[PDB]
Design a protein around this ligand. Structure first.
Ligand code: A1JFZ
Lengths: 39, 146
């Protein structure tokens, strides 16, 4: 079955790399928890 | 004990990640499907869960309540399988929905990273990573209700 192992503190890091875009997307959320794009 | 944790299943594989805060373990529903979790010789049982939000809490109610401020960079505290926890800073995009806007991060990590927390500049968990869409994967910043 399933088990947990600690991996770190919940902390902001001053030395953090910045990456990734910031897209603005229209989406719908269905009953199964799935997001889908809308146009 | 407070912190970010790997969710393992048994060879052993990492199926996800979660957050221990205020005595409650928080992860995404699709990671565990609500299964009980071993923590030492103890067992953690689900207390609240919601498939539509894709969230589940163990041992008590959902405790995480901070939200993205809509303007500031955030950090994904990513815990990928087999890799040390690492912080990835990013400016969220936005999922625009009929029920309001949700922050989203355009970061693509292995599936076993699902449940990793997204943090604001004060170190508060503003949501979990791993439920999203493809346009390249974009994750909602999924936050529950306290
Ligand atoms: C250890 N067995 C847990 C069982 C079976 C898997 C789901 N579940 C639950 O107790 C539960 O399910 C929802 C949707 C909320 C809660 C509290």
């Amino acid at each position: 079955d399933m088990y947990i192992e600690r991996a770190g503190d919940i902390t902001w890091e001053k030395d953090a790399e910045v990456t990734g875009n910031s897209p603005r997307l229209d989406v719908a959320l269905d009953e199964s928890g799935d997001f889908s794009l809308v146009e | 004990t407070d912190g970010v944790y790997r969710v393992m299943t048994r060879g052993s594989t990492q199926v996800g990640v979660g957050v221990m805060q205020e005595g409650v373990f928080h992860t995404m529903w699709h990671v565990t499907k609500g299964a009980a979790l071993r923590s030492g010789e103890g067992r953690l049982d689900p207390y609240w869960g919601d498939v539509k939000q894709d969230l589940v809490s163990y041992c008590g109610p959902w405790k995480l309540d901070a939200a993205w401020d809509g303007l500031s960079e955030v950090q994904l505290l990513a815990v990928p399988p087999g890799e040390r926890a690492k912080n990835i800073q990013t400016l969220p995009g936005i999922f625009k929905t009929k029920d309001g806007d949700i922050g989203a991060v355009a970061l693509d990590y292995p599936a076993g990273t699902s449940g990793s927390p997204i943090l604001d500049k004060s170190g508060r968990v503003i949501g979990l990573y791993g439920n999203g869409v493809v346009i390249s994967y974009v994750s909602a910043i999924t936050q529950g209700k306290r």
